[PDB]
Design an enzyme around this catalytic site. Structure first.
Site, PDB file in Angstrom:
ATOM      1  N   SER A  43       0.683  -1.121  -0.052  1.00 49.49           N
ATOM      2  CA  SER A  43       0.010   0.205  -0.052  1.00 49.49           C
ATOM      3  C   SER A  43       0.640   1.419   0.045  1.00 49.49           C
ATOM      4  CB  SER A  43      -0.787   0.117   1.292  1.00 49.49           C
ATOM      5  OG  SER A  43      -2.000  -0.805   1.130  1.00 49.49           O
ATOM      6  N   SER A 101      -5.362   3.159   4.060  1.00 47.50           N
ATOM      7  CA  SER A 101      -4.974   2.072   3.194  1.00 47.50           C
ATOM      8  C   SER A 101      -5.942   1.608   2.270  1.00 47.50           C
ATOM      9  CB  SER A 101      -4.195   0.968   3.594  1.00 47.50           C
ATOM     10  OG  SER A 101      -2.999   1.518   4.178  1.00 47.50           O
ATOM     11  N   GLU A 141      -5.349  -3.486  -6.618  1.00 42.32           N
ATOM     12  CA  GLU A 141      -5.522  -4.099  -5.227  1.00 42.32           C
ATOM     13  C   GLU A 141      -6.645  -5.299  -5.414  1.00 42.32           C
ATOM     14  OE1 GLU A 141      -4.072  -3.843  -2.408  1.00 42.32           O
ATOM     15  OE2 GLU A 141      -3.338  -1.745  -2.221  1.00 42.32           O
ATOM     16  N   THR A 210       2.044   3.263   5.320  1.00 42.68           N
ATOM     17  CA  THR A 210       2.333   1.853   5.367  1.00 42.68           C
ATOM     18  C   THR A 210       1.818   0.957   4.316  1.00 42.68           C
ATOM     19  OG1 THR A 210       0.231   1.398   6.151  1.00 42.68           O
ATOM     20  CG2 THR A 210       1.904   2.245   7.775  1.00 42.68           C
ATOM     21  N   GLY A 211       2.594  -0.034   4.083  1.00 43.28           N
ATOM     22  CA  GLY A 211       2.204  -1.222   3.336  1.00 43.28           C
ATOM     23  C   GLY A 211       2.330  -2.729   3.991  1.00 43.28           C
ATOM     24  N   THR A 212       1.612  -3.626   3.508  1.00 45.53           N
ATOM     25  CA  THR A 212       1.469  -4.882   4.352  1.00 45.53           C
ATOM     26  C   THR A 212       1.232  -5.570   3.282  1.00 45.53           C
ATOM     27  OG1 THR A 212       0.979  -3.707   6.259  1.00 45.53           O
ATOM     28  CG2 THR A 212       0.948  -6.321   6.096  1.00 45.53           C
TER      29      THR A 212
END
Length: 266
Positions: A43, A101, A141, A210-212
């Site tokens: 993200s 996100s 996504e 953030t990203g995950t």
């Protein structure tokens, strides 16, 4: 002392691959650790995505109402999935994409750029316009989170994403009014309290995205301001790909990497 040794110990302790880039300044050396290795965006692309939309539109575009359906909801969309009946404005979608996100928001902003790949080519082209010759977005996504290790699709490098964020928030890639909106959304992010923010002392300002993802991917891209107002970009990317596709992402690794960086920048 050798900061690289301390990053390597984090890699051992968390069974992870860590990537760090803090661009150099007039008064500070770059911090670089695996900075030219590829890591999945996850993200983190939503920050430059919002910049891409801001870049090519007047600010009046933020008032445009976008409607969508329950069938458009994608993993994970905390805001969009509550506004199927009302729609959301482009500005609300930017807010959601950065602060929560929101995947549907991101896919709708990709569609707002339009063109092949549902906007993914357009997004990659925006990065090319900022001098980023390595990064690429290939999927929307949530598929962009799920490429196997070594696949170059949907990757960036700490170096590349840091220099993108440097231009966007601390440079003149955007006019100052547009820059202020990107900065404010990142400043009010709700998803980052256990990542870079957790590694910097409370008297530093932190804005972040953030990203995950799969393979234990956990990223955070931030701009931080010292207590005297001196700014730095901090890109931290990680994965735990040795553990397989369902390896747990570890926020603590990013917090500790950020603590090591804060130690150098203080």
């Amino acid at each position: 002392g050798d900061l690289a040794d301390r990053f390597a110990e984090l890699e051992r302790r968390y069974d992870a691959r860590l990537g760090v880039y803090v661009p150099a300044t007039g008064t500070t050396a770059a911090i670089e650790y695996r900075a030219d290795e590829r890591f999945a965006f996850c993200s983190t692309f939503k920050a430059p995505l919002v910049a891409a939309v801001l870049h090519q539109n007047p600010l009046t575009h933020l008032d445009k109402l976008i409607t969508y359906t329950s069938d458009d909801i994608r993993s994970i969309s905390p805001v969009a999935q509550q506004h199927v009946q009302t729609g959301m404005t482009i500005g609300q979608l930017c807010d959601a994409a950065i602060r929560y996100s929101d995947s549907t928001a991101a896919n709708l902003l990709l569609a707002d750029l339009g063109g092949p790949g549902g906007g993914t080519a357009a997004f990659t082209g925006y990065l090319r316009s900022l001098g980023d010759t390595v990064s690429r977005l290939d999927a929307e996504e949530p598929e962009l989170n799920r490429d196997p290790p070594g696949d170059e699709r949907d990757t960036t490098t700490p170096h590349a994403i840091a220099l993108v964020l440097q231009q966007l928030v601390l440079g003149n890639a955007l006019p100052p009014d547009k820059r202020a909106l990107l900065t404010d959304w990142m400043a009010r992010n709700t998803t980052g309290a256990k990542r870079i923010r957790a590694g910097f002392p409370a008297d530093w300002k932190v804005i972040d995205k953030t990203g995950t993802g799969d393979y234990g991917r956990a990223n955070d891209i931030a701009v931080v301001w010292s207590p005297t107002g001196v700014p730095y970009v901090v890109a931290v990317m990680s994965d735990r790909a040795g553990g397989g596709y369902d390896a747990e992402p570890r926020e603590a690794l990013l917090a500790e990497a950020a603590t090591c960086v804060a130690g150098v920048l203080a």
